[PDB]
Scaffold this active site. Structure first.
Site, PDB file in Angstrom:
ATOM      1  N   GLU A   1      43.474  57.323  54.071  1.00 19.18           N
ATOM      2  CA  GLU A   1      44.415  56.226  54.267  1.00 19.18           C
ATOM      3  C   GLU A   1      44.990  55.715  52.955  1.00 19.18           C
ATOM      4  O   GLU A   1      46.180  55.392  52.894  1.00 19.18           O
ATOM      5  CB  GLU A   1      43.741  55.079  55.012  1.00 19.18           C
ATOM      6  CG  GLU A   1      43.172  55.498  56.335  1.00 19.18           C
ATOM      7  CD  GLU A   1      44.044  56.520  57.015  1.00 19.18           C
ATOM      8  OE1 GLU A   1      45.126  56.145  57.510  1.00 19.18           O
ATOM      9  OE2 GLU A   1      43.657  57.705  57.035  1.00 19.18           O
TER      10      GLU A   1
ATOM     11  N   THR B   1      37.143  48.980  21.080  1.00 17.24           N
ATOM     12  CA  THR B   1      35.936  49.433  20.416  1.00 17.24           C
ATOM     13  C   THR B   1      36.147  50.671  19.566  1.00 17.24           C
ATOM     14  O   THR B   1      35.192  51.149  18.952  1.00 17.24           O
ATOM     15  CB  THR B   1      34.848  49.717  21.445  1.00 17.24           C
ATOM     16  OG1 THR B   1      33.632  50.043  20.770  1.00 17.24           O
ATOM     17  CG2 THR B   1      35.261  50.884  22.296  1.00 17.24           C
TER      18      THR B   1
ATOM     19  N   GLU C   1      26.437  64.493  24.737  1.00 17.82           N
ATOM     20  CA  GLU C   1      25.203  64.174  24.040  1.00 17.82           C
ATOM     21  C   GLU C   1      24.066  64.033  25.043  1.00 17.82           C
ATOM     22  O   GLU C   1      24.270  63.522  26.144  1.00 17.82           O
ATOM     23  CB  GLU C   1      25.339  62.887  23.238  1.00 17.82           C
ATOM     24  CG  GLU C   1      25.661  61.663  24.069  1.00 17.82           C
ATOM     25  CD  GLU C   1      25.659  60.391  23.249  1.00 17.82           C
ATOM     26  OE1 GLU C   1      25.126  59.378  23.737  1.00 17.82           O
ATOM     27  OE2 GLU C   1      26.185  60.404  22.118  1.00 17.82           O
TER      28      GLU C   1
ATOM     29  N   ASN D   1      28.995  47.140  35.022  1.00 20.70           N
ATOM     30  CA  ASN D   1      28.807  48.288  35.891  1.00 20.70           C
ATOM     31  C   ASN D   1      28.290  47.872  37.254  1.00 20.70           C
ATOM     32  O   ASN D   1      28.547  48.559  38.246  1.00 20.70           O
ATOM     33  CB  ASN D   1      27.847  49.277  35.247  1.00 20.70           C
ATOM     34  CG  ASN D   1      28.311  49.724  33.891  1.00 20.70           C
ATOM     35  OD1 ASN D   1      29.459  49.506  33.513  1.00 20.70           O
ATOM     36  ND2 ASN D   1      27.423  50.365  33.147  1.00 20.70           N
TER      37      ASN D   1
END
Ligand SMILES: Nc1nc2c(ncn2[C@@H]2O[C@H](COP(=O)(O)OP(=O)(O)OP(=O)(O)O)[C@@H](O)[C@H]2O)c(=O)[nH]1
Ligand SMILES: Nc1nc2c(ncn2[C@@H]2O[C@H](COP(=O)(O)OP(=O)(O)OP(=O)(O)O)[C@@H](O)[C@H]2O)c(=O)[nH]1
Ligand SMILES: Nc1nc2c(ncn2[C@@H]2O[C@H](COP(=O)(O)OP(=O)(O)O)[C@@H](O)[C@H]2O)c(=O)[nH]1
Ligand SMILES: [Mg+2]
Ligand SMILES: [Mg+2]
Lengths: 107, 258, 436, 430, 53, 436
Positions: free
Chosen positions: C253, C178, C70, C227
């Site tokens: 690593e 959700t 979108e 976030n």
């Protein structure tokens, strides 16, 4: 009157404390001992540190090294022209020859 | 807010109605009275609704687009600052924004860099920095003619003297790791170079001053690396990562050779 | 050292919008693109080269591709304050959603969007010279993040093969959820997340919610706070490539020292100290207790309990005021304590790493500016508990053939469902058997 | 005359080397600019052992740096005494092994080692009479262990006569950084028992123990661990560089300490080392040096010598000393602790004296004791190696590269029979 | 009286004899840590007062 | 060395709050956290480390956890003067009370709060390094003080065990009483207080009311004055840990020198001189009379008369200007007098301790600045009198099964009523046999 840890000995004599021996035998940490006895420890071991020009940078071991210009020697790293962000990786020496930003000042 | 440092944020820049600026220029001394007397007599307590009402009464005028422009600009201005978003932080900020048609006004812009015929000057955080053309680029400086022959023979004495000038006990090598060699001032470096090489022509001396003043760290007054400054002066090259916006094209497009 | 970061989905590019804001702040890049006026003649760090590329005249265009279907959230990026920071071509955007439909995102819209996506990434890798690896960002709940996410990881693995692809994925939490079809999306995605990701890092949302509720005392957290701290974790495990440290670890690593078997790559991340500005005022920050704080389940990034599991290996990124002296002392105390236990086959189950630059704050963020921090990335069998917890509520809905008509109509069949289910069963048997 | 070519492998190799070249440069009075500044003439005659005169008092070290990551080289070049090495000798790759012995031995080593062999050979014939090569590396990482090991095997095939020292730190479980430490240490040690001439086993565990108990420092960064190991290396080669009443070269020490060709793993110490709070209260005598030299808590390995027997031992002294005092102390030490010394070798202590101390010290010492307590270390590593290898943990990272299973079986068997031969020589009689 | 006519190996902190080759002075032991911690405290107080405000 | 103090109950945290006021005044801590060096003449030292930890940035937080179930009094602390002193995170506050109910506080609600409490105390004990022991403050009359107070002590003995757990409890007074179900509460608490407390010290309230009425002649005291002189007792028995004296006695000695059998730890306490600001000037304070005055029942902290009992052992803490000569003379003449008698099998029934620092005053308190003071902690058979008097009126109420439906409804049964009854019976047989 705040009470000391070891105020007087068996005789009626005041006690002069040795912070260096404490810092050695880790009965207290040195960072604490110097601040707690700033009068003797400055005479016994301590001296002030060099500060960066910009106070927004955090003050840590490596920042003090890069402040008093012992960074590359004491700590394995690369010295930087900037001082706001001292620990920025700079790879001018190791850059391959055809890299777009490479000077040959060292060679 | 206008007194803030002013940063490079991109702009929106609506196109303004044509007959709007010349009318605001003479109307705003009345709009400032209207908004204040509607807000209760003090600045910084004006709602955008009250400001729009004061504007509509002070300038009857106001065709559709000419009003919509003011409304949209006021809306952007009120959201500029994080916080309550119930009042206006600075009425002068709003006025300037309405005149220019830019969400962030011309007055809040950067200082810029002056570029007289040869020199290039940048006002930076700590002082000003300057770069003189006709004898350099960002990376490679133009070495004087008779300097390298005289420098390469007495090369090492220069630093021995430069450290002795700032207080290095040359018998023991403890001070090099102590860090006294790290801190060397620029006039002291050039004075040590004078005491080593004797008479230093003004041109060669200026070359030295320029290279050292480059290699010095920002903030503090002393250079970062003396043995590196050695090979710097020897090679005539510098690790400057000369940046883009206005210095990089101006060096390589203009004719600075002759 | 250079690493490019691709974002798949509406959750992916919101994480990226927080990560890149943090990166520009760590390197001093103004949001219009270029460094301030101080650094125009001599410059400085040269550390940015692993994320940005110095283009043209005073511009640093990052090494990433936002991709979504979108145009809503992508155009929000195009019209935000970072209009100038991202090259227009990199911010890919389709025309219609996959709409929580794995089949729609994997067979209907993928076939025309992924060719443009990987033909961008190819010219990003060609501009690159010393590519360390790719790192992908996706939430497996939706359709874009899972559907063409899985399609992209497949075509990346056929184009490059062995290159390290760090997968920072987001699973559905057990209770806070959700969507409804997210079990179907998650199962069909994990069958290829198992096989094409090199190292995968789980990030459930309710775990981060409890973090912001309990520690940062944000009583009403939105997605931007989540976030933000996810970006802090990414920054802390890439700071070794960016800034020099006393004991550095690169992306290679993690693949070496945390993946004891090629089919076991699922890492419970963590972070410490996640402390507000007032609790920081009250609590001291030392290496011993923040190493302890990185191990308690009240500070992990995934809602699972490792007391039920056995640690396979552990990685510890330290930043700031850290000497190897006390981190050796701390891991000593950890290895002598018995409230947590390791797997017998690993006797040296740690790997430390130290960097000099402390983490930064973002104005508008709620974390306090600290001198030191720790980011753990471990491996255990609590992950094997997660997959079975998700497997059961997938088999619930699949028993009554719920929502199947959507996928079958879009182009798949029911053999994909049976094969994805028996894959999770095999992976469960694998985790139980390794933990012995 | 007698020459030492220095080789530094990997990050630890380069940082030890950086402090080492700082220490030697101060002992010979050469400044960061690469020119002479000292006072005594006794410094000049034996800098041919380490340097090469370039132009008008310009001495560049005889070193070859080798690793796989740019950050290590810049840490080398950026510090003081960093602008003195020759840039040609900085053979250097930029992919990175990353704690992978197979990467450091088959993929990256196999193509980078030829360029390293060019530089080492070029610097080997740059001098007249090689005393031996001096390789300093680690056994935890890959670019140090793996590539360093292949370098050892290739050099020993080219020049088999000259000596070969190797200062190798061994991963200890107490301070254990990575996870594949045993997988690297086991394979590396197996090659060291067949290629290296003599090895000097260090470990960070005992180094930290020293800086805490003896030195009693507060923040022992890696700078001081390199400081200690560098002082050990300087003490080893003082006899080449300075006149002594009883000289002892590298080949002289090796022939006095190694009774059998496979049995060449030494444990090292140094004297004096005292805290600054306790430097006011001490004296400087030969007994004051011996009491700290033979002290079990001053070895630079994590092997308690009273758990085994000292096969042979050696002591290098520096300063204005009396050889009678030197030899009487060694005799008394040998006679008091008469059980920790092997029976079938009488007079197990080789000794030597040099007249030139380090700059500022009055007297110093260095100990090299070839004991049979070193099989404690190899058993401590081999038990972790077999703990994983019974279960093929982390095994794919090597098998998917060119390594097979037989390499691990033979590496474990070579470790097994070595600690077996050390046990038998410890339990031998006369 | 060689013992009585001899100086201690290290006299205090600043000593011109003690270079890097002699191991009596170590950089790792720092006597500035005490005041460095004070600087840390000042930094933290300022930072957190600002953040709280 | 460190000692951390936990407080259970509404009386627990009120006692805790008088103690921590006294501690902050003793080490010169301003309530906002830091100590001003200028104002305090005393020499600086790390004596405070056994209570306060050097946290944050120039800050000291106590090694304490208040815990209670009602948010009322805890939130009152969070609003009072010492807001910035404590953590907001160490004051554990439930949402609903136990409400005078061992059952509700031990089975229903304790199982939710005990996990958060002891998994926070682990983080305090981890911050410590030389932990001497825990010390608990509680009143056994209430619900949370008794119920989860016993649940906490039980899981402490399991988690740590060998670390010393000093107990200062508050038993209900014989005639002055505030509750009705307190016999059931005190009994069901003391069955576990037997085998889980290391050293228990009884504190009754009417005894302290007697003290403030007779000695301090405050005719209308509050709980604050009671709290204040109880803090005088606690401070005076930890002063040897904090400030070294001529003859120090740590927290490990009371266990050694006063507990002759592992199931006999109940200690009468006392204090002298408890003297107002006007009797202080007139009365000449010397070691002889304060050692005498700390031995009459008119000056004890428990309403019992040891004249009916035999002193099993004693412990004398001295503070101030005390030389060992006269304290040895006073303990001599006490040993020779026959008004009190020591048990025959214990010939040397004393342990003295001496500290130089005089006990401080709280400006606005009722005590005057005193040169020397005595804190006695003894052991006798008068405690066998207390428990038997309490056992009588427990079986009085239990005969008609009064109030029992409360406990059974919460989840109990009748077996623990029976076994807690006979447990007190066995203990009575124990004390009567040891006194022989
Ligand atoms: N951690 C985290 N997860 C997010 C955030 N925003 C959305 N999500 C997750 O996204 C999942 C749903 O998929 P979306 O990202 O919203 O949309 P999509 O993945 O692109 O799929 P489509 O809606 O079909 O385009 C939910 O499970 C959310 O948990 C965020 O800011 N942080
Ligand atoms: N000595 C003393 N006892 C107190 C004080 N405050 C309360 N108490 C006692 O506390 C006992 C009852 O317990 P409380 O603390 O009042 O209440 P609780 O412990 O929280 O138990 P619940 O009320 O059921 O939650 C009573 O016997 C009181 O005598 C005090 O300041 N000093
Ligand atoms: N003494 C010392 N040991 C080190 C140093 N750096 C790393 N180590 C040890 O070496 C091991 C890892 O070595 P590594 O850096 O991977 O070797 P390399 O990468 O091949 O050069 C760890 O166990 C560290 O404890 C150092 O500067 N000095
Ligand atoms: Mg979506
Ligand atoms: Mg209550």
């Amino acid at each position: 009157v705040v009470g000391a840890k070891v105020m007087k000995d068996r005789d009626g004599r005041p006690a002069v404390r040795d912070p260096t021996f404490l810092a050695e035998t880790q009965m207290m940490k040195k960072d604490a001992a110097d601040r707690l006895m700033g009068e003797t420890a400055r005479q016994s071991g301590a001296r002030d540190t060099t500060m960066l020009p910009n106070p927004d940078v955090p003050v840590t071991i490596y920042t003090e090294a890069v402040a008093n210009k012992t960074y590359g020697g004491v700590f394995p790293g690369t010295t930087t022209l900037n001082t706001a962000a001292p620990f920025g990786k700079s790879t001018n020496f190791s850059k391959p020859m055809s890299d777009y930003s490479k000077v040959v000042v060292d060679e | 807010m206008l007194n803030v440092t002013g940063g490079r944020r991109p702009v929106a820049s609506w196109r303004t109605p044509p007959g709007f600026l010349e009318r605001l220029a003479d109307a705003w001394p009345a709009v400032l009275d209207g908004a204040v007397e509607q807000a209760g007599g003090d600045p910084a307590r004006v709602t955008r609704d009250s400001f729009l009402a004061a504007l509509r009464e002070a300038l009857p005028g106001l065709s559709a687009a000419e009003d919509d422009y003011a409304r949209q600009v006021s809306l952007s201005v009120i959201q500029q600052v994080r916080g309550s978003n119930v009042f206006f932080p600075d009425l002068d900020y709003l006025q300037a924004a309405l005149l220019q048609g830019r969400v962030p006004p011309q007055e809040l812009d950067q200082p810029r860099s002056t570029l007289s015929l040869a020199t290039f000057t940048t006002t930076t955080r700590s002082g000003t920095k300057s770069l003189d053309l006709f004898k350099t680029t960002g990376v490679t400086w133009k070495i004087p003619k008779g300097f390298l022959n005289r420098y390469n023979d007495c090369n090492h004495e220069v630093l021995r003297r430069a450290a002795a000038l700032v207080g290095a006990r040359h018998d023991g090598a403890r001070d090099v790791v102590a860090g006294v060699w790290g801190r060397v001032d620029v006039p002291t470096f050039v004075e040590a170079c004078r005491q080593v090489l004797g008479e230093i022509s003004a041109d060669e001396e200026e070359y030295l001053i320029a290279l050292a003043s480059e290699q010095v760290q920002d903030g503090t007054a002393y250079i970062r690396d003396l043995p590196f400054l050695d090979k710097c002066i020897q090679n005539g090259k510098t690790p400057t990562s000369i940046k883009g916006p206005e210095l990089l094209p101006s060096i390589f497009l203009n004719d600075t050779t002759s | 050292r250079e690493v490019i970061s691709i974002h798949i989905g509406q959750a992916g590019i919101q994480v990226g919008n927080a990560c890149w804001e943090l990166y520009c702040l760590e390197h001093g890049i103004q949001p219009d693109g270029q460094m301030p006026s101080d650094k125009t003649i001599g410059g400085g760090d040269d550390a940015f080269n692993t994320f940005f590329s110095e283009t043209g005249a005073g511009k640093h265009v990052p090494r990433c591709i936002f991709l979504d279907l979108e145009p809503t959230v992508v155009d929000e990026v195009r019209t935000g304050t970072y209009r100038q920071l991202f090259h227009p071509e990199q911010l890919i955007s389709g025309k219609e959603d996959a709409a929580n439909n794995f089949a729609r995102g994997h067979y209907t819209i993928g076939k025309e969007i992924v060719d443009l996506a990987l033909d961008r990434i190819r010219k990003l890798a060609d501009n690159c010279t010393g590519l360390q690896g790719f790192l992908v960002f996706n939430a497996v709940g939706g359709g874009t993040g899972s559907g063409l996410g899985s399609l992209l990881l497949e075509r990346l693995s056929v184009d490059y093969g062995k290159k390290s692809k760090l997968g920072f994925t987001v699973y559905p939490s057990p209770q806070v959820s959700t969507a409804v079809v997210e079990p179907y999306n998650s199962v069909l995605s994990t069958h290829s997340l198992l096989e094409h990701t090199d190292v995968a890092v789980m990030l459930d949302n309710e775990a981060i919610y409890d973090i912001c509720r309990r520690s940062l005392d944000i009583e009403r957290p939105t997605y931007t706070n989540l976030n933000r701290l996810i970006a802090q974790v990414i920054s802390s495990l890439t700071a070794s490539l960016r800034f020099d440290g006393a004991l550095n670890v690169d992306i290679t690593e993690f693949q070496t020292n945390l993946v004891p078997y090629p089919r076991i790559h699922f890492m419970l991340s963590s972070y410490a100290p996640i402390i507000s500005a007032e609790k920081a005022y009250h609590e001291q920050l030392s290496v011993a207790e923040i190493t302890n704080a990185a191990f308690e389940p009240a500070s992990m990034m995934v809602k699972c309990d490792p007391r039920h599991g056995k640690y396979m290996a552990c990685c510890l990124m330290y930043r700031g005021d850290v000497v190897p002296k006390d981190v050796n002392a701390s891991v000593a105390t950890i290895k002598t304590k018995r409230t947590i236990q390791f797997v017998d086959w690993c006797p040296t189950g740690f790997k430390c790493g130290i960097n000099y630059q402390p983490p930064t704050v973002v104005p508008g963020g709620d974390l306090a500016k600290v001198q030191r921090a720790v980011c753990m990335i471990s491996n255990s069998t609590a992950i094997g508990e997660i997959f079975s917890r998700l497997d059961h509520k997938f088999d619930l809905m699949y028993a009554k053939r719920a929502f199947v008509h959507w996928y079958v109509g879009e182009g798949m069949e029911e053999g994909e469902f049976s094969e994805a289910r028996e894959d999770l069963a095999a992976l469960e048997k694998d985790f139980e058997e390794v933990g012995a | 005359m007698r020459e030492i070519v220095h080789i530094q492998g990997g990050q630890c190799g380069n940082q030890i080397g950086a402090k080492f070249w700082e220490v030697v440069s101060d002992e010979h009075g050469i400044d960061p600019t690469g020119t002479y500044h000292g006072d005594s003439d006794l410094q000049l005659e034996r800098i041919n052992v380490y340097f090469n005169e370039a132009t008008g008092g310009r001495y560049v070290p005889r070193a070859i740096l080798m690793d796989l990551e740019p950050g290590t080289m810049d840490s080398v070049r950026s510090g003081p005494y960093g602008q003195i090495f020759r840039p040609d000798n900085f053979v250097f790759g930029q992919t990175g092994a990353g704690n992978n012995w197979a990467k450091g031995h088959y993929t990256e080593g196999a193509e980078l080692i030829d360029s390293v062999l060019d530089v080492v050979r070029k610097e080997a014939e740059s001098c007249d009479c090689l005393q031996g090569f001096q390789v300093c590396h680690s056994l935890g990482g890959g670019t140090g262990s793996g590539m360093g090991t292949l370098l050892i095997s290739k050099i020993r095939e080219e020049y088999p006569d000259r000596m070969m020292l190797t200062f190798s730190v061994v991963p200890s479980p107490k301070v254990s950084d990575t996870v594949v430490e045993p997988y690297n240490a086991t394979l590396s040690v197996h090659q060291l028992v067949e290629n290296a001439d003599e090895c000097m086993v260090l470990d960070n565990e005992a180094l930290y123990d020293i800086c805490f108990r003896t030195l009693k420092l507060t923040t022992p960064t890696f700078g001081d661990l390199n400081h200690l190991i560098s002082a050990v290396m300087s003490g080893i080669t003082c006899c080449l560089r300075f006149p002594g009443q009883l000289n002892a070269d590298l080949r002289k020490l090796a022939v006095n300490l190694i009774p059998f060709p496979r049995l060449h793993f030494f444990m090292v110490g140094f004297t004096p080392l005292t805290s600054r709070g306790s430097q006011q209260y001490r004296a400087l005598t030969v007994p004051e040096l011996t009491q700290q030299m033979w002290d079990a808590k001053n070895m630079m390995c994590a092997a308690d010598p009273r758990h085994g027997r000292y096969l042979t031992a050696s002591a290098l002294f520096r300063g204005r000393m009396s050889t009678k005092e030197v030899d009487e102390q060694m005799l008394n030490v040998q006679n008091k602790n008469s059980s920790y010394f092997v029976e079938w070798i009488p007079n197990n202590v080789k000794s030597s004296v040099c007249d030139i101390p380090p700059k500022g010290l009055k007297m110093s010492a260095t100990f090299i004791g070839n004991s049979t307590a070193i099989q404690e270390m190899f058993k401590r590593v081999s038990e972790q190696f077999t703990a994983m290898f019974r279960r093929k943990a982390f095994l794919h990272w090597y098998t998917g590269e060119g390594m097979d299973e037989m390499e691990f079986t033979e590496a474990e068997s070579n470790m097994n029979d070595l600690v077996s031969e050390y046990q038998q020589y410890q339990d031998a009689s006369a | 009286d060689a013992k009585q006519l001899d100086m201690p190996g290290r006299v205090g902190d600043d000593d011109n004899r003690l270079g890097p080759s002699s191991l009596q002075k170590f950089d790792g032991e720092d006597l500035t840590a005490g005041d460095r911690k004070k600087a840390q405290i000042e930094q933290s107080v300022n930072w957190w007062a600002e953040q709280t405000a």
